[PDB]
Design an enzyme around this catalytic site. Structure first.
Site: not given
Lengths: 108, 76, 73
Positions: A78-80
């Site tokens: 989710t960080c990308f």
């Protein structure tokens, strides 16, 4: 939730192109999702159901080929806004695995 | 004996197991019923993650005990 | 770089930050423009609660990224 802005700015990795049969089956599945299925998919792949400032197109989502056919479920980072999608053998298999993933998964 | 595995959907997967069954065997039965590979499963009973190499007896899991299935997928 | 911070009320605060900024700094800046004390702020990016001792790059927060402000008490 404009899933058409999301599709317009989506990148593809690991051999997936916008022409891959799997990717077209994917967007057919995603555009036909219920509003709750849409919020679940966004919660799963980006960490949130609320669209950013600027719209879903700001996510620059990446769909990366997660290897050949398998029953292994799709994964995400989710960080990308990265969605790892194995090349599934069918569309209903892709829908079944993807829906089970976004419904059963919670956590990191 | 019967045990129940509750998903976040609320759905309940009912497994037929023995107390001497390993945690690996339980993941294999869940795999047979749901397709989820064992390394994408995490099994919770009494707040503990269930570890491979141990039996249901070692955790004192009884008939109609309820476990929780959370899937290791969205590691972000 | 520029980032956005959307509240529960739907209001969006626009911040100019540098990627090396820590999350204490962003909470202090939110306090500067809106008055909310940093201990009443809870900042989320990518589903994760953001730790004060971390930088925006640690969470891959880029230009025009939007964080979520929940009020922490």
């Amino acid at each position: 939730l404009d899933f058409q802005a999301l599709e317009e700015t989506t990148e593809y990795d690991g051999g997936y192109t916008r022409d891959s049969v799997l990717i077209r089956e994917f967007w057919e599945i995603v555009h036909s999702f219920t509003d709750e299925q849409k919020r679940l998919f966004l919660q799963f792949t980006t960490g949130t159901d609320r669209a950013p400032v600027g719209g879903l197109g700001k996510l620059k989502m990446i769909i990366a080929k997660n290897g050949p056919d398998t029953e292994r479920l799709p994964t995400s980072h989710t960080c990308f806004n990265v969605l790892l999608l194995p090349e599934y053998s069918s569309k209903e298999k892709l829908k079944e695995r993807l829906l089970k993933a976004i419904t059963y998964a919670k956590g990191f | 004996m019967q045990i129940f595995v509750k998903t976040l959907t609320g759905k309940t997967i009912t497994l037929e197991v023995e107390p001497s069954d390993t945690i690996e065997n339980v993941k294999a039965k869940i795999q047979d019923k749901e397709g989820i590979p064992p390394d994408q499963q995490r099994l919770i009973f009494a707040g503990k993650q269930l570890e491979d190499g141990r039996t249901l007896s070692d955790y004192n899991i009884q008939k109609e005990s309820t476990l929780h299935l959370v899937l290791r997928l969205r590691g972000g």
